[PDB]
Amino acid sequence: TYTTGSFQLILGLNAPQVISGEGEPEGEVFASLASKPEAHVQELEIRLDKDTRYLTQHTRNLQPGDTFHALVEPIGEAPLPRLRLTDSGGKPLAFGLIDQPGESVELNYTCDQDICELVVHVDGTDGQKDSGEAVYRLLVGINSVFLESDLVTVGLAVDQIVGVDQRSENFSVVGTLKLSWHDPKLGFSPDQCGCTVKSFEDASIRAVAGEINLPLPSFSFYNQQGNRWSQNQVIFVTPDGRASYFERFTVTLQAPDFDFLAYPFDRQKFSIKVDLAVPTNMFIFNEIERFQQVVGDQLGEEEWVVTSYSQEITEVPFERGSTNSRFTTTLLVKRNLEYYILRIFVPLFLIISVSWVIFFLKDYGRQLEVASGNLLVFVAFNFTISGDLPRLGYLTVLDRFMIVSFCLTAIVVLISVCQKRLGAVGKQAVAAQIDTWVLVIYPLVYSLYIIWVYLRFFTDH
Amino acid sequence: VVTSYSQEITEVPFERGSTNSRFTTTLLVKRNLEYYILRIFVPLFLIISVSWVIFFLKDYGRQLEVASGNLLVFVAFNFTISGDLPRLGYLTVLDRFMIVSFCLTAIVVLISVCQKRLGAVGKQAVAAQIDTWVLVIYPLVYSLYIIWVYLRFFTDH
Numbered sequence: 001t002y003t004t005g006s007f008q009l010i011l012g013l014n015a016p017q018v019i020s021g022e023g024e025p026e027g028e029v030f031a032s033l034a035s036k037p038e039a040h041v042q043e044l045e046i047r048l049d050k051d052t053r054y055l056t057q058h059t060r061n062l063q064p065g066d067t068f069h070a071l072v073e074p075i076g077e078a079p080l081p082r083l084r085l086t087d088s089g090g091k092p093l094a095f096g097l098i099d100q101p102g103e104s105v106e107l108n109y110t111c112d113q114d115i116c117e118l119v120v121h122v123d124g125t126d127g128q129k130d131s132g133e134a135v136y137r138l139l140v141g142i143n144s145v146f147l148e149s150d151l152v153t154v155g156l157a158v159d160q161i162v163g164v165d166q167r168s169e170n171f172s173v174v175g176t177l178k179l180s181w182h183d184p185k186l187g188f189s190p191d192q193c194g195c196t197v198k199s200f201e202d203a204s205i206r207a208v209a210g211e212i213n214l215p216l217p218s219f220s221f222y223n224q225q226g227n228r229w230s231q232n233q234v235i236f237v238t239p240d241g242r243a244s245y246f247e248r249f250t251v252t253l254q255a256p257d258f259d260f261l262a263y264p265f266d267r268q269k270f271s272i273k274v275d276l277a278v279p280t281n282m283f284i285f286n287e288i289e290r291f292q293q294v295v296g297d298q299l300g301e302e303e304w305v306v307t308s309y310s311q312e313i314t315e316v317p318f319e320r321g322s323t324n325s326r327f328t329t330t331l332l333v334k335r336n337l338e339y340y341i342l343r344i345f346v347p348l349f350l351i352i353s354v355s356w357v358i359f360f361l362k363d364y365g366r367q368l369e370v371a372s373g374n375l376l377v378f379v380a381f382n383f384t385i386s387g388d389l390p391r392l393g394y395l396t397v398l399d400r401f402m403i404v405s406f407c408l409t410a411i412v413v414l415i416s417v418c419q420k421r422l423g424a425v426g427k428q429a430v431a432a433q434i435d436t437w438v439l440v441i442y443p444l445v446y447s448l449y450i451i452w453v454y455l456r457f458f459t460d461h
Numbered sequence: 462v463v464t465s466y467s468q469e470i471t472e473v474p475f476e477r478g479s480t481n482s483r484f485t486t487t488l489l490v491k492r493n494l495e496y497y498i499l500r501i502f503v504p505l506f507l508i509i510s511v512s513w514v515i516f517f518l519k520d521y522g523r524q525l526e527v528a529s530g531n532l533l534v535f536v537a538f539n540f541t542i543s544g545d546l547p548r549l550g551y552l553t554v555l556d557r558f559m560i561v562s563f564c565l566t567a568i569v570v571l572i573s574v575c576q577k578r579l580g581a582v583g584k585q586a587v588a589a590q591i592d593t594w595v596l597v598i599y600p601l602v603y604s605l606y607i608i609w610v611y612l613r614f615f616t617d618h
């Protein structure tokens with residue numbers, strides 16, 4: 001291909017030093033710049049929401065002697081906005097003149113210095129935003145009229161969800177980060193190295209920008225807690241201006257999108273947000289690279305499992321009207337449920353049934369002997385399981401079922417006492433009516449409780 | 462403990478066709494098993510049989526007092542050992558045996574209640590047939606469970 005960049009030209013007439021690399025200017029002048037001009041014109045439909053109501057676009061680079069025209073127009077019946085042109089420093093070079101009919105605010109300028117580096121402004125500063133949807137066609141021209149954000153393709157993949165802190169509403173994950181992006185200003189000329197590839201290893205895009213003193217697409221994991229353990233870190237740059245970043249990492253992230261209210265029947269969102277650290281006007285995320293399986297299927301492992309992974313490009317505001325790209329890889333998860341209903345629920349059931357079948361007995365002495373004894377087994381079992389249950393400072397559904405379960409088992413002891421007295425007073429057919437009396441209201445209440453909670457916690461009621 | 466160590470040279474792909482050497486030293490390991498079957502399995506057994514020999518009794522009153530009491534000892538023991546057992550968020554085979562073990566011990570309490578009422582209704586030779594009735598299906602079920610798991614978890618079935 002053709003190649004690009006800047007050069008130093010030494011021209012010599014009867015001067016053998018010039019072919020030796022040796023340019024010191026001397027003598028009488030013989031040469032210079034050799035010859036409407038070339039024109040460049042651009043469309044863009046700009047949009048002005050409540051969010052974004054001033055907008056500026058840096059122009060790219062006019063020669064002394066170049067003329068610049070720009071025109072705005074309303075898409076619907078939206079108001080005629082304020083137009084102006086300005087240098088990079090903000091000193092004004094023109095203003096918009098609203099036209100003969102009053103439909104287009106046009107502006108004009110031709111160029112003074114050997115660099116004119118112009119900036120176009122359009123504002124909807126004039127009125128209160130009524131529904132925040134007035135949008136404009138903007139025409140622009142000199143005689144790629146606007147200098148555009150270079151386009152980065154980002155990719156992410158997770159290998160291990162290695163920690164979840166349920167109390168502090170955060171988690172930890174191991175994964176792989178790739179950004180690939182074509183910027184000519186990066187360009188390596190080959191004869192220096194003697195290679196196609198230049199490598200920077202073990203440092204942060206930020207640090208390499210600082211070393212090179214140029215702009216690069218730096219980023220941060222948005223909710224990062226403390227430090228990240230990054231290995232196989234690297235950034236590759238070819239001659240072309242094609243560049244790539246590769247980083248396996250192990251990061252700890254705050255996710256207060258946790259809700260543990262329906263534990264263990266809760267489901268959760270692990271979101272891995274990757275924001276840039278430079279605005280939309282310099283770099284933006286343009287593609288998603290499916291460089292590997294996004295979520296890595298080791299299934300035996302099992303503690304939290306994965307429903308679906310959706311990873312997506314979105315632009316978010318930051319300070320100084322920093323609007324910048326954000327690459328959200330967000331895993332959907334649920335707990336391993338066999339662990340809960342087998343280890344917790346099944347046994348619990350049995351403890352509750354023991355209290356219900358001792359109502360059959362009619363030897364209230366013994367009914368109460370077992371009733372009381374089984375309450376201890378309940379409490380006993382309730383702290384067997386207290387380990388896999390986490391302390392948060394608020395009630396999960398399980399904690400809710402468990403209180404009710406205990407309360408019903410304690411009242412069987414209370415009822416059993418009641419009936420034993422009745423037995424020894426010789427109203428034993430009262431106490432036998434009671435026996436069969438409970439036998440049916442009582443497991444009816446467990447079942448109704450459950451229905452209550454399912455509706456209370458699961459059904460948008 | 463270590464079963465064998467095999468260490469080996471192999472080349473794997475990386476960034477921009479980086480194909481590079483990898484030196485894998487890979488140890489094979491197993492747990493110290495005496496610790497498990499002595500500390501966990503042997504005692505558990507004993508708790509299991511206590512429930513089976515109280516089926517012999519035919520004083521269902523007392524059968525049930527021991528039956529119930531021994532369930533607590535089971536739960537008690539099950540959390541003695543809860544320390545050396547690690548919380549993962551999913552069932553290991555031990556966790557599997559332990560649930561089944563507890564469930565069978567809870568139904569002895571349930572059966573013991575059943576038989577006691579039968580006794581006081583004066584169908585005591587029903588309840589005595591039951592006694593000998595379990596005595597044999599019940600430790601048959603532990604043994605079949607075990608066979609089930611060995612096949613479920615160990616034998617590529």
Ligand SMILES: [Ca+2]
Pocket residue numbers: 169256257258259
């Ligand atoms: Ca929250």
Ligand SMILES: [Cl-]
Pocket residue numbers: 382402403406
């Ligand atoms: Cl409790």
Ligand SMILES: [Cl-]
Pocket residue numbers: 343347384539559560563
């Ligand atoms: Cl248990």
Ligand code: NA
Pocket residue numbers: 161162163164303
């Ligand atoms: Na984990």
Ligand code: NA
Pocket residue numbers: 167168
């Ligand atoms: Na907290």
